[PDB]
Enzyme design. Structure first.
Site, PDB file in Angstrom:
ATOM      1  N   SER A 185      -5.321  -7.553 -11.209  1.00 36.17           N
ATOM      2  CA  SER A 185      -4.699  -7.356 -12.490  1.00 36.17           C
ATOM      3  C   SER A 185      -3.437  -8.145 -12.384  1.00 36.17           C
ATOM      4  O   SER A 185      -2.476  -7.674 -11.779  1.00 36.17           O
ATOM      5  N   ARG A 186      -3.368  -9.332 -13.033  1.00 40.99           N
ATOM      6  CA  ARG A 186      -2.273 -10.254 -12.818  1.00 40.99           C
ATOM      7  C   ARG A 186      -1.060  -9.677 -13.509  1.00 40.99           C
ATOM      8  O   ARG A 186       0.062  -9.822 -13.029  1.00 40.99           O
ATOM      9  N   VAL A 187      -1.302  -8.920 -14.614  1.00 40.65           N
ATOM     10  CA  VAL A 187      -0.305  -8.287 -15.446  1.00 40.65           C
ATOM     11  C   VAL A 187       0.475  -7.285 -14.635  1.00 40.65           C
ATOM     12  O   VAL A 187       1.702  -7.236 -14.692  1.00 40.65           O
ATOM     13  N   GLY A 188      -0.234  -6.518 -13.783  1.00 39.46           N
ATOM     14  CA  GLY A 188       0.396  -5.709 -12.780  1.00 39.46           C
ATOM     15  C   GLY A 188       1.112  -4.503 -13.307  1.00 39.46           C
ATOM     16  O   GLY A 188       0.743  -3.924 -14.327  1.00 39.46           O
ATOM     17  N   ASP A 190      -7.363 -11.673 -17.732  1.00 34.14           N
ATOM     18  CA  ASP A 190      -6.163 -11.389 -16.984  1.00 34.14           C
ATOM     19  C   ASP A 190      -6.516 -10.562 -15.776  1.00 34.14           C
ATOM     20  O   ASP A 190      -5.712 -10.467 -14.851  1.00 34.14           O
TER      21      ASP A 190
END
Lengths: 236, 48, 253, 85, 265, 120, 116, 83
Positions: free
Chosen positions: D34-37, D9
Site C-alpha cells: 500500500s504505497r499510500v501507507g 496504488d
C-alpha cells in the site's frame, strides 16, 4: 530540457517517471498503428524510440542534461525486454528493492546491485575506490556468513570474521539516514552528508575508529559527527 | 571423596602456576544438565 | 559475455596491443582495425574515440557508426557495409581485424525491420533467416590463399548475453558458425577480476597455428595448472591434504 | 494484471497455500503493498503495529532456513517462536 | 502454476543445498580434531585393556549410549537405537542412560520407563575428561551402578571414515576385578583396594574412550551425509530444471501461435 | 619398557628407570620389574630413558607393570616444570575457600597439589 | 461451520492443514529422509499418509474395475470416522488397513484381516 | 495424446527405463489402464488375475516411499512384486 541545454545554455537535471510507462504506452499505440507487436508485446520500434530519447539527453558543449529516469521493473524481472533495453542505455544503474526498505534502511538501494560506470578507480579517486572496494568485500563476507550465523550461530567463526560481520552491521545501519521528504514518510528530519565526509566516515568505520559506538547509534542518522552525538543519546 | 572425583579435581588443579593451554581448560569444563528421568517422567534437569 | 561489462573494453585492449604491431613495417602485421559500433550511443562511441586518440590508435582505425538513434535499416546493413571495406584490405593482401559490436542488437534491428515488412517471426521471435544473415557476414573473415594473396580479415564478433544464456537462438547459431568462443564470466567480473573470463568456457579451435611457438611451450602447463586450481577450489571451501593446498597456492598466484 | 498493477496504488496478494495452511481468508503480504501507507492508518494502530512488521519480516527469513528441523541458534529461534505465534 | 511450483520447490531445494554444503564444510573442520583425539584416548585405553586381558577379567544391568544433542549427522542416532532395542530384548529390565538428546529421543519412544537417568548438554562439545568423570560420578552415585550385574556402553565405532558400526563393550565392575584369577601377577595390598579405585577409574577411562570413538564416527558421518545430501539436491535441481525448460518452451509455443493468429487476420 | 599414555597425548608409549609416586609411597621400576598394579597417587614423576631424565607432574592414575615388562601408565594429563608463584597465592585463596565445606575437600586437594608442585 | 456445522468444519480444517504440511515436507524428505524429520513433523507426516490411504473408498460399479466390492459410508459415519483418526485413535493401524476401504470400522476389521 | 485417451478404452504406456532393463519391449503398468475389465475375458483369466493389478501397484507404492526404513510386511509385498 533542450531549451535549457541549448539556448539558455545551462546544465540541467532531467527527471522522468516511470519510463516503463513510456514503453507500455508505446505498446498500446503499436497495436493500434497496426504494427505487429514484437517480444513480450512490446513495440518493434522500442529500441529506436528509447534511443532517440536517450541520445537527446546528453552533455553537449552548451549544456549538460542529467537524466534521472525512474524505471518500474515489472515483476522485478530485468530480463523483461523493456528493462533490459534500458539497462544498456543507462550510465548509472540503481536498484531499489523492497527488502532493504523493509530492513528499515532508507534508501532502499540493493548495495551490490548499485553500479555506476562513472564509478571508477581514478575517476572518483583511488582513496574513494579502495575504501568502497573494502565495503563491497565486507558486505560479501557478511552475506556468506549469514548462513553460518543462521543455524550454527555467530560463534564458531573467527574473531576476525565476527568483526567483519559486526562492521558490516554498523555500516548497514550507517546507510540508514533519514530524508527531509521523509518528514511525512517517516516524520524524521533529513540529513545531507558531504561527499568528502562520506569517504572519511566510511574509512573511519572500517578502521574501527568507532567500533566502540553501538550499531543502532549509526541507525537512521547522518555523518560521523551525528553518530558520535547519537552515541551520547543512547548513552543517556 | 570418590576416586574418580579425586583424580578429576587434581587434573583441574594441574591447569594452574599458569602456563597451560586453552585446550587444557576446555578439557576441564562442562556445562550440562543431568536429566533425571526417574520413573519416563523427568525430575528436573539439574546441572552437570 | 554479459552486457557492457567492459565488453568493448576487452576488445579495445587488442586494438591497443595492435598499435605496436601496426608500427611494424610488415604489412601483414599492419592490421587496420575496424570497430563497428552497432546501436551504440554517440556518447559511448565518443569515449571510444577519445581513448583511440589518446593511445594514438586513430591512424588505422575505422569506426563504422550506426548509433543508437540511427535507423534500423542502417543498423542491419552496418556490418555488411563494413565487411566490404574489410574485403578491400584483405584482397589487397593486407590483414585487418573487424570487431562487430554487438550483433545481438544487430539481430534486434533485423527483427524490427522484418516485422515492419510483415515478414514472419521465428524462434525466440527472431527471423529464421537471421542464421543465414549471420553466416554470410562471418564468411567474409578469411585467411586467403596465396594465389588470392596472403591477406586476411580477422573478426571477433561480440555477443551480449542476457544473463549468460548462450542457449538463446542468436548465440547458438553464432557459436556453431564461428571457431572458438570467449565466454567472459560475470561472477569473476563482479568479484573484480578484470579481465573476467572463465577459460573453462572459452575455447579456440584455431589452436597453436595461431600461437607463438615459444608461448606454446610455456603454456601447456599453464592451462593444466589453472584447471586444477578450479577443480581443487572446492577442497578449500574444508580441512584437507597438503597436496591440495600446494595446488591452490600455485593456482592463486 | 500487469497493466492494472501499474495503475493501482496497492496489491493485496493472497496465497492459496496459506489458505490451506489455515488462514481462511489467507493474505500473503509479501506481494501486498500500500504505497499510500499509514497516513490512512489510525495513529494508535500505527504505534502498535509498528514492529509487527519487523517481527514478521524477520520471521519470514528465519522460518525459511528453519525448515530443516535442526536445532538452530537460540536468537534465530526467538524469532522463530515469536513469529509462529 | 507448473512454473511457480517448479520454481518455488527448486528454490527450497537450493536453500537446502547451500545449507547441506555449509554443514559438510564445518563437519570436515571438526573432523580433524575428532579423529586426532580418538587416537590419543584409544592408545591410553589399550594400555588399560592390557591389564584386563592379562588379568583375565570378563564380567539390573546398565545400558549407556552416546550421541550428541545435535541432529543431522547420519543415522547414527537410530542405528545405535536399533542395536540398543535389540539389547532391550536381551534384557528388558536394563536401565538406559542416554547421553545425547537425539539418542534420548529414539530410545525414549521404545521404552520410557527404562530411561531413569539421562544426560543432556554434552553433545555440543567434543568428548572431554571433565564430562566423562562427572557423568561417571553421577552414574555411581545416582544409579549405584556397581550393584548392576554388568555395565554395557554403546557408542559408534568408526569402522572406516566412510562407515560407522555401532559397538558396545562391557565396563568391568569391581566384582570382576576381584574375581579375575590373574591379579596376583598384578600384586597389590589389601590397603588401597584396587577394585574400588580401578572400577571407578576405568568407568571414566572406558567411557571417555567410548565417547571419543562415537564422536569421531558422528562428525565423520556428518561430513559424509551432508555431502550425499548435496548430491541428492543436485539431482532434484536438475529434475526441476527440465520441467522449467519444458514449461518455458510451452509458453513460447503459445506466444508464437498468438502472433501467427494475429498476422493471419 | 614404559608406555606412558594419556587421552591427550602419548608421552612415552627402553625407558630404563621410572620413578613414580603411588599410594604405596614411591615406587621405582627398572628394566624387568615384577608385574604389579599400583594406583598412582597425584605425583611428581621422573622418567629416565637411559641417563636422560624428564620430569612429569601427573594427575594420578594407574600404573601397571605388565608381565611383558610394559609399564602402562595411564593418567589424565601430565613434564610439569614449564607450567610454574600466583598459583600458590590463588591456592591460598582456595584454602580460605575450604571454609566452605565437597568444596572444602576439592580445595584441600588443590592445597596438596600446590605443596607437591612447590617442592620442585 | 454452520452448513455442515462447527464439528465437521473443524475436522475438515485440520485435514486441510495437515495435508498441506505433508506436501510441504516432500522436499526435505527426499533430500534427506523422513526419519531425518522432527518427531512432531513425523507424526503429522505419518498421519497424512494414513489420511491419504483412507480416502480411497470403493464404489459399487467400480467393484468391476478394482475387484473390490463398493463402499458407501453414511454422512454421520464420515464425521465420526475422521474425528477419531485425527485424534490418532486408530493411528497405530497399518496403512494397508486404511487402504482401499470405506469407514473407520472397515479399517479396524481389515487390520484383523492383515494380522492373519 | 490426451484427446485420444479420453476416446480410448484404456492406454498401454511403455517405460524407457524398463525397455533398456530387459523387457524388450517394456510395458509401464503404472500408466497402463483398461476401462472394460475382465468381462472381456473368461472366468479362468479373471479368477487367476484377481488383485494382481493392485498388488503391483502396491509394490510400486512400497518403492515410492522406500526412498527411510519400512516394515517387513511392505518388504514381503515388495519381494513378491519384484519376483
Amino acid at each position: 530540457a533542450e531549451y535549457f541545454r541549448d539556448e539558455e545554455g545551462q546544465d540541467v537535471l532531467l527527471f522522468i517517471d516511470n519510463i516503463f510507462r513510456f514503453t507500455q504506452a508505446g505498446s498500446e499505440v503499436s497495436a493500434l498503428l497496426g504494427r505487429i507487436p514484437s517480444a513480450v508485446g512490446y513495440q518493434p520500434t522500442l529500441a529506436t524510440d528509447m534511443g532517440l530519447l536517450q541520445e537527446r539527453i546528453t552533455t553537449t558543449k552548451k549544456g549538460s542534461v542529467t537524466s534521472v529516469q525512474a524505471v518500474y521493473v515489472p515483476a522485478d524481472d530485468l530480463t523483461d525486454p523493456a528493462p533490459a533495453t534500458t539497462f544498456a542505455h543507462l550510465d548509472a544503474t540503481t536498484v531499489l528493492s523492497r527488502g532493504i526498505s523493509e530492513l528499515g534502511i532508507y534508501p532502499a538501494v540493493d548495495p551490490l546491485d548499485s553500479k555506476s560506470r562513472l564509478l571508477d578507480a581514478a575517476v572518483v579517486g583511488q582513496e574513494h575506490y579502495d575504501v568502497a572496494s573494502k565495503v563491497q568485500e565486507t558486505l560479501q563476507t557478511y552475506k556468506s556468513l549469514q548462513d553460518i550465523i543462521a543455524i550454527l550461530g555467530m560463534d564458531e567463526l573467527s574473531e576476525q570474521d565476527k568483526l567483519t560481520v559486526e562492521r558490516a552491521r554498523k555500516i548497514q545501519r550507517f546507510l540508514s539516514q533519514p530524508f527531509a521528504v521523509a518528514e511525512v514518510f517517516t516524520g524524521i528530519p533529513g540529513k545531507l552528508v558531504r561527499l568528502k565526509d562520506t569517504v572519511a566516515s566510511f574509512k573511519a568505520v572500517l578502521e574501527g575508529k568507532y567500533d566502540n559506538i553501538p550499531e543502532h547509534a549509526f541507525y537512521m542518522v547522518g555523518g560521523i559527527e551525528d553518530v558520535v552525538a547519537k552515541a551520547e543519546k543512547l548513552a543517556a | 571423596i570418590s576416586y574418580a572425583a579425586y583424580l578429576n579435581v587434581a587434573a583441574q588443579a594441574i591447569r594452574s602456576t599458569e602456563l597451560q593451554t586453552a585446550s587444557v581448560l576446555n578439557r576441564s569444563q562442562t556445562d550440562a544438565f543431568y536429566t533425571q528421568y526417574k520413573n519416563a517422567s523427568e525430575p528436573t534437569p539439574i546441572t552437570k | 559475455g554479459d552486457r557492457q561489462t567492459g565488453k568493448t573494453a576487452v576488445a579495445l585492449d587488442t586494438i591497443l596491443n595492435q598499435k605496436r604491431w601496426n608500427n611494424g613495417s610488415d604489412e601483414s602485421k599492419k592490421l587496420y582495425c575496424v570497430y563497428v559500433a552497432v546501436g551504440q550511443k554517440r556518447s559511448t562511441v565518443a569515449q571510444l574515440v577519445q581513448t583511440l586518440e589518446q593511445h594514438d590508435a586513430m591512424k588505422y582505425s575505422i569506426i563504422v557508426a550506426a548509433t543508437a538513434s540511427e535507423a534500423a535499416p542502417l543498423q542491419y546493413l552496418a556490418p555488411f557495409t563494413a565487411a566490404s571495406i574489410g574485403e578491400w584490405f584483405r584482397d589487397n593482401g593486407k590483414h585487418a581485424l573487424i570487431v562487430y559490436d554487438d550483433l545481438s542488437k544487430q539481430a534486434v534491428a533485423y527483427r524490427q525491420l522484418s516485422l515492419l515488412l510483415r515478414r514472419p517471426p521465428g524462434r525466440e521471435a527472431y527471423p529464421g533467416d537471421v542464421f543465414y544473415l549471420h553466416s554470410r557476414l562471418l564468411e567474409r573473415a578469411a585467411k586467403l590463399s596465396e594465389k588470392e594473396g596472403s591477406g586476411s580479415l580477422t573478426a571477433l564478433p561480440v555477443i551480449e548475453t542476457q544473463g549468460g544464456d548462450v542457449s538463446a537462438y542468436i548465440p547458438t547459431n553464432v557459436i556453431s558458425i564461428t571457431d572458438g568462443q570467449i565466454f567472459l564470466e560475470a561472477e569473476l567480473f563482479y568479484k573484480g577480476i578484470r579481465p573476467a573470463i572463465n577459460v573453462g568456457l572459452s575455447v579456440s579451435r584455431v589452436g597453436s597455428a595461431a600461437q607463438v611457438k615459444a608461448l606454446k611451450q610455456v603454456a601447456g602447463s599453464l592451462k593444466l595448472f589453472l584447471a586444477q586450481y578450479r577443480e581443487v577450489a572446492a577442497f578449500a571451501q574444508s580441512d584437507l591434504d597438503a597436496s591440495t593446498k600446494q595446488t591452490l597456492v600455485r593456482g592463486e598466484r | 494484471p500487469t497493466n492494472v498493477i501499474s495503475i493501482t496504488d496497492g496489491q493485496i496478494f493472497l496465497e492459496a497455500e496459506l489458505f490451506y495452511k489455515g488462514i481462511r481468508p489467507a493474505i500473503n503480504v509479501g506481494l501486498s503493498v500500500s504505497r499510500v501507507g499509514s497516513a490512512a492508518q489510525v495513529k494508535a494502530l500505527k504505534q502498535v503495529a509498528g514492529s509487527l512488521k519487523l517481527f514478521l519480516a524477520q520471521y519470514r527469513e528465519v522460518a525459511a532456513f528453519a525448515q530443516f528441523g535442526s536445532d538452530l541458534d537460540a536468537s534465530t529461534k526467538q524469532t522463530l517462536v515469536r513469529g509462529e505465534r | 502454476a507448473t512454473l511457480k511450483e517448479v520454481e518455488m520447490r527448486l528454490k527450497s531445494i537450493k536453500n537446502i543445498e547451500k545449507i547441506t554444503k555449509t554443514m559438510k564444510i564445518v563437519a570436515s573442520t571438526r573432523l580433524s580434531k575428532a579423529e586426532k583425539a580418538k587416537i590419543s584416548a584409544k592408545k591410553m585405553d589399550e594400555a588399560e585393556q592390557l591389564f584386563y586381558k592379562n588379568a583375565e577379567t570378563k564380567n539390573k544391568e546398565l545400558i549407556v549410549a552416546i550421541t550428541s544433542d545435535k541432529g543431522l549427522c547420519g543415522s547414527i542416532h537410530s542405528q545405535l537405537a536399533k542395536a540398543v532395542r535389540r539389547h532391550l530384548n536381551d534384557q528388558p529390565n536394563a536401565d538406559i542412560v542416554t547421553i545425547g538428546d537425539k539418542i534420548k529421543m529414539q530410545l525414549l519412544r521404545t521404552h520410557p520407563n527404562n530411561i531413569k537417568l539421562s544426560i543432556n548438554g554434552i553433545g555440543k562439545d567434543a568428548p572431554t575428561f571433565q564430562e566423562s568423570a562427572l557423568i561417571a560420578d553421577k552414574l555411581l552415585s545416582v544409579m549405584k551402578a556397581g550393584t548392576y550385574p554388568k555395565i554395557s556402553i554403546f557408542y559408534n565405532d568408526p569402522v572406516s571414515s566412510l562407515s560407522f558400526e555401532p559397538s558396545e563393550k562391557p565396563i568391568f565392575n569391581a566384582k570382576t576385578i576381584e574375581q579375575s584369577p590373574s591379579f596376583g601377577k598384578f600384586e597389590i595390598d589389601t590397603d588401597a583396594n584396587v577394585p574400588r579405585d580401578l572400577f571407578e577409574y576405568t568407568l571414566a577411562n572406558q567411557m571417555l574412550t567410548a565417547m571419543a570413538q562415537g564422536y569421531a564416527a558422528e562428525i565423520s558421518a556428518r561430513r559424509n551425509a551432508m555431502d550425499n545430501a548435496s548430491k541428492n539436491a543436485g539431482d532434484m535441481i536438475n529434475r526441476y530444471s527440465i520441467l522449467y525448460n519444458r514449461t518455458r518452451q510451452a509458453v513460447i509455443t503459445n506466444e508464437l501461435v498468438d502472433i501467427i493468429t494475429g498476422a493471419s487476420s | 619398557k614404559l608406555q606412558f599414555a594419556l587421552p591427550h597425548e602419548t608421552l612415552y608409549s627402553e625407558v630404563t628407570q621410572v620413578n613414580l609416586p603411588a599410594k604405596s609411597g614411591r615406587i621405582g621400576v627398572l628394566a624387568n620389574h615384577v608385574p604389579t598394579v599400583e594406583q598412582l597417587l597425584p605425583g611428581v614423576v621422573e622418567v629416565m630413558e637411559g641417563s636422560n631424565s624428564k620430569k612429569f607432574f601427573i594427575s594420578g592414575g594407574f600404573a601397571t607393570v605388565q608381565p611383558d615388562s610394559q609399564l602402562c601408565v595411564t593418567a589424565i594429563e601430565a613434564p610439569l616444570e614449564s607450567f610454574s608463584e600466583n598459583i600458590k597465592n590463588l591456592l591460598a585463596e582456595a584454602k580460605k575457600n575450604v571454609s566452605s565445606s565437597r568444596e572444602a575437600a576439592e580445595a584441600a586437594i588443590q592445597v596438596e597439589v600446590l605443596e607437591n608442585l612447590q617442592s620442585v
